[PDB]
Amino acid sequence: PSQVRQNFHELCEAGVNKQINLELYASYTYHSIAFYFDRDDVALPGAHKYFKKQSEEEREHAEKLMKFQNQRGGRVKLKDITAPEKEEWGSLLDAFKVALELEKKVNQSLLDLHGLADSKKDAQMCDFIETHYLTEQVEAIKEIGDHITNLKRVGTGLGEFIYDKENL
Amino acid sequence: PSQVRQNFHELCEAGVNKQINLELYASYTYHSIAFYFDRDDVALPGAHKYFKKQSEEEREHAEKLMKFQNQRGGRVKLKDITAPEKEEWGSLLDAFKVALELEKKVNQSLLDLHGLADSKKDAQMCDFIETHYLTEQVEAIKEIGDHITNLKRVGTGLGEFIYDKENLK
Amino acid sequence: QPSQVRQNFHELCEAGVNKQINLELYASYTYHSIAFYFDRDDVALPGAHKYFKKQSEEEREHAEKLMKFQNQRGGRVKLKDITAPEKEEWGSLLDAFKVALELEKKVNQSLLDLHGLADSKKDAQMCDFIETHYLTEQVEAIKEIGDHITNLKRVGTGLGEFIYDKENL
Amino acid sequence: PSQVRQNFHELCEAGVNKQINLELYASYTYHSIAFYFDRDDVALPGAHKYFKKQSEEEREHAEKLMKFQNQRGGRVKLKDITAPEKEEWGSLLDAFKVALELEKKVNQSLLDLHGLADSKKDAQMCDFIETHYLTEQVEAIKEIGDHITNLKRVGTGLGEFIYDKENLK
Amino acid sequence: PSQVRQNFHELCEAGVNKQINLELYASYTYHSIAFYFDRDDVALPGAHKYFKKQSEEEREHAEKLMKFQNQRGGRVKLKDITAPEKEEWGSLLDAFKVALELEKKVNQSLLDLHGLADSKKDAQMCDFIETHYLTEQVEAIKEIGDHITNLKRVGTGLGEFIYDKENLKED
Amino acid sequence: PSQVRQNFHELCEAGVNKQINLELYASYTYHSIAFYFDRDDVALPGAHKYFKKQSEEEREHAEKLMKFQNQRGGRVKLKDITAPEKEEWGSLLDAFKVALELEKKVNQSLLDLHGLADSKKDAQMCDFIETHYLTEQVEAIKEIGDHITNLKRVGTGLGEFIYDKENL
Ligand SMILES: [Mg+2]
Ligand SMILES: [Mg+2]
Ligand SMILES: [Mg+2]
Ligand SMILES: [Mg+2]
Ligand SMILES: [Mg+2]
Ligand SMILES: [Mg+2]
Ligand SMILES: [Mg+2]
Ligand SMILES: [Mg+2]
Ligand SMILES: [Mg+2]
């Protein structure tokens, strides 16, 4: 056992390792969407920059968790990062619709992980997930909700280009 | 009778407390409108910022009447603030139409208050109403009128998003 | 149909938020009242006037923050009338700060009741939100008041109330 | 009971008073280590500066708890601060081995104190420990484990001198 | 067929997508090495900073080929990103040995991809790999070569600490 | 042993260690008086700040004697830091009355140590405590003297509050 390890269940160590995969998976999906909007047949430069930053924030959510593993004295176990479920993401609206599902999936995965923290009475692991993840997820989902509502209000023609140029 | 009271009738004093309530009611209604546009299924952040400023300005309107009351020797009496008329405020144009009837409602209240002050030969209350409320209210009604005219020019859909970003931010 | 953002947010919790925003605004309304009582010519404590105005506004932002929370999680903001304050005449500075200790303890307990509901329905984020923005700010507000109450007891009734107002408010 | 006391069990107060002593014992222990490295036969100036700072950072932890005791309306009870368990601390590696055993004892005291807090539905007190202590202890234990790993790597003689100059100042 | 596409063979398009995967594999491997050094039993914060950096440069190598794939009107195609060969990377010298082998592997695929571009008379694709990839990889291999020679010269204990603080925690 | 040791008596080492405990004792006592003024039913924030400043200055008095012990080549020996004599320190005037007596006890202790150093012809040790301790103690006792006088002058109620703002 690590010299720093105290109050850190091997089941919670496994839990964290499953999260860093989900986040890296999320990161990799935003990256696909990012470079899909750089396509000459799509040409939406604001979505390219927005989803590239969304991808970089998840490599960070993963790093922070990788950081948390070493802090608590766990051992980081990587698995393959699965390819995104799509190659063509359709409209700007379709892309945010995929974003909302991805974020809900990740939120739940953290809510279950937090569940597993409370269960084995890991007050610090809980704080860590409350403080860096749970409110940042709620913020992220509202933002995506707002984007969906505004992409529906704008049409699919002129409004898409304007929303791309102004709100991303 | 307050040591400061001079040429300040008790129906006028009653009249100021009725106005104070109308300002808090308007504030509350604009508070409602401001947070309806923060909803994920509405999401007009311009309208959010705008109606929040309008609510803070009606509280300042109430506060100046609260202050005025104390200046004249009167005594501030607070009633309940009635909840806004609706939960769901509809489109941007629907929200600004409510705002117009509201401001005409409080404008009419102020003009009646002026009339009362004037029948009781209270010059300084007339000046106070003239100076801080009546021109404020005409400007505020002309502003709302323009927003309505513009919200009808721009359509629903894209029109609502452009006007939100360009004219409320 | 639920809001497209709504996840892990029980309707008891939603209904909970809506109840706390009213209490927040009830408390804002009461502090406003204490505010302008100190602005009266026959009370004339301009420190206390400033202190309570600032207090009224902070609670409007506490409700304003809970309206943001409501919309973030997919809940729907529902306003009731804001009850009028319990008193017109708030007495001495010490009396006013005693009403503030009663009021902040009701509001703290209302939040601690709301957290427990949060915890009941395994709503981790709502618990963090009430812990982060409300529970520590309440404990700081109540201690400040106790200190004020103590210090208002230590100084006299007369000269002492003037100095405390000038100096600590 | 203090005029500010609300949802603060007298076992949570007793618990808070046990932790101020543990922080002061750790503070005192780091103070001995500090001045052991200032001895002409140890002469390690980085460790001296480091462990003085570690001692100063406790006492602040003791103070933040004495501070919270008063916030909640509890009553600070000061027991003897027990002498360090040694005069002679040995190597720089030997000192960080003691720090690791000390910080875990401290951590386990804080986790125990949190569970007692959770047991008596003291949401704010849990939030206090979570915010100010639980994360701090973890960062602190990781830092001490890194130090231990690093002083085994360079190992005795020049490696001790360099680790003192480069990684402690 | 893409409105911009001109003088871009479907096997070349196929080759670019194979490099983006190798570059994302390298980024992931350097990502794993990075956090190994942040373990409390490895505690080498210089190597952690340094491999953290080398990993982000590989996601940038991938992004430039993604960016290029789009410019030529080819379509980006994402395979799974294979988990790294190990969790126990060993010594600072061991990690730099795994890096000289990972970097000679990427360079050879890059040299084959250029060969293919030349084969298909794609001057621009060739120039593009010459400009952003070929001398960067040579520069990257020379730098790792020097690290290995230096990790060899310094000790296993104290030498590993100094070299971390001096040549990697700075850089 | 000690390669730096010269003209330093084993009773002088012992006296220094005895003085370090007295200074840490005073620090603890000022500490208690600190947070006693931080109570919601006492609430004198001036006194709180003043006594926190005095607790730190004594730990400093302790640290400088620890520093002196090592300079002369003696060995620091720590004992338990005795807990304060009271929990409830009463009035602002009560707390300064306690300060004076603590300061005089600590001063007489220094004057005994100086005497002991003089008896052993430790010229540097006498100057050390003359330079950093004996005059500082006289300045501290007289400051407390002024405080006691002024607290009697201001009296019990308002004057407590006014002296706490204006003069601490
Ligand atoms: Mg994420
Ligand atoms: Mg108005
Ligand atoms: Mg005029
Ligand atoms: Mg509040
Ligand atoms: Mg501590
Ligand atoms: Mg918590
Ligand atoms: Mg590369
Ligand atoms: Mg002293
Ligand atoms: Mg002399």
Residue numbers in the entry:
A (entry chain A), F (entry chain H): 3 to 170
B (entry chain E), D (entry chain G): 3 to 171
C (entry chain F): 2 to 170
E (entry chain B): 3 to 173
Please share excerpts from the published article on this structure.
Ferritin is considered to be an ubiquitous and conserved iron‐binding protein that plays a crucial role in iron storage, detoxification, and immune response. Although ferritin is of critical importance for almost all kingdoms of life, there is a lack of knowledge about its role in the marine invertebrate sea cucumber (Apostichopus japonicus).
In this study, we characterized the first crystal structure of A. japonicus ferritin (AjFER) at 2.75 Å resolution. The structure of AjFER shows a 4‐3‐2 symmetry cage‐like hollow shell composed of 24 subunits, mostly similar to the structural characteristics of other known ferritin species, including the conserved ferroxidase center and 3‐fold channel. The 3‐fold channel consisting of three 3‐fold negative amino acid rings suggests a potential pathway in which metal ions can be first captured by Asp120 from the outside environment, attracted by His116 and Cys128 when entering the channel, and then transferred by Glu138 from the 3‐fold channel to the ferroxidase site. Overall, the presented crystal structure of AjFER may provide insights into the potential mechanism of the metal transport pathway for related marine invertebrate ferritins.
